[PDB]
Structure formats: C-alpha cells, structure tokens
Amino acid sequence: SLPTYRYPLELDTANNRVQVADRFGMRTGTWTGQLQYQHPQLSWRANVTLNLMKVDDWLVLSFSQMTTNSIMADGKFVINFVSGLSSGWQTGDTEPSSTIDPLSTTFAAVQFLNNGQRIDAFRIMGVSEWTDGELEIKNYGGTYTGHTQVYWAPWTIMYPCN
C-alpha cells in the first residue's frame, strides 16, 4: 500500500511527484513588540519590528538599524514571542531544537554616543535560552566606553529551530 508523506516531504498530486515543500527552504514572518534589556543596574523596553525567516531547520532573526538607550558592559536581551507574531506563526515556531548554550553567537556593530562623539564598537550576542515563548539573547560583552545612547547597525542572528 502507497505511503503518505510528512512535512517537509509532500506529494504533488497533479504531477504524481514527491518533493520537498518550497516553504521548507524559506518561510517569512514578522514580530512586533518590545525588545527588553535587563541588567541589575539598568533595564529598559524598546519598540522594535524583526523580520523572521525559517530556512530548513534554522530560524533567522533580522534586525534593522535601531537607536536604544545606554547599556552596561554585559547584560541580556529578551524577545517575548507570546504576542506580536505575524499571521501563520505560532509562538511555538520560535522554540530552539536544543538546550545547548550558546546555540549561536554573532556580533552586532554599534556606535556608542558620548557627549557629541560617536564611538564605533561591537557587541557579542549569544542565543542562550527560550522559556515559554521568551527568547534570551545574552550580550557577553565586546568593546565598551561610557555612553548615553547606542546606534545599532542592522544584524542577523540564527539558531537551530526544527
């Protein structure tokens, strides 16, 4: 008896052809919410919109340029996927497929604004944890100087998500 096929595999009945679904290589969405920065001496919330892309067994988060308040030498960022996901996306779709820490690391290019001067620097960001829809991205450090505001260039980060 002929088998059925489980996603990403699918049967195209018009041509009687088994294939990998086109959505598997690319599924887009957006998340609109508040990016939370957390540190014992400083915490804030900034309104952001991220582009999302599921590519095979990976989830890619794409940040456009942003201006945020000042940050400490290290700290953590939290994205709450409980609300804000575009249609077709469920909170569970952002859950990592492993509990290894870090799952992924990337660098974000920033300018620290101090007085009137812009100081180019970097921030190392690690996907560290997911708990009931809340994704934790730890900022371990990077180059630092005293500042009043942060200009973040665009950046992407991805993690295994199946």
Q: Which residues are near Mg ion by CB under 5 A? A: 69-70, 148
Say which residues have a Cβ less than 8 Å from residue 98's Cβ, sequence separation at least 6.
Answer: 160
For residues 97 and 161, is the Cβ–Cβ distance under 8 A? yes
113 is a contact residue toward a second copy (CB under 8 A): no
43 is a contact residue toward a second copy (CB under 8 A): no
Please choose, out of 38-46, 85-93, 129-137, 141-149, the segment that lies near a second copy by the rule CB under 8 A: 141-149
Least distance to Mg ion from the beta carbon of 42, Å? 9
For residues 84 and 78, is the Cβ–Cβ distance under 8 A? no
User: Of residues 46, 48, 78, 122, which one binds a second copy by CB under 8 A?
Assistant: 122
Q: 57-75 burial, b for 16+ CB within 10 Å, e for fewer?
A: eebbbebeebebeebeeeb
Among residues 33 and 126, whose Cβ is nearest to a second copy? 126
The number of CA neighbours under 13 Å toward the Cβ of 74 is: 4
For residues 80 and 145, is the Cβ–Cβ distance under 8 A? no
DSSP 8-state code for residue 94 = G
Question: Cα 67–125–117 angle (5° rounding)?
Answer: 35
Query: Among Cl ion, Mg ion, a second copy, none, what binds residue 69 when CB lies within 5 to 8 Å by partner kind?
Result: Mg ion
Interacting residues with Cl ion (CB under 5 A): 90-92
Interacting residues with a second copy (CB under 8 A): 1, 3-6, 8-9, 11-12, 15-20, 22, 24-26, 28, 51, 53, 55-58, 60, 62, 64-65, 97-98, 100-107, 109, 111, 120-122, 124, 126, 140-144, 153-156, 160, 162
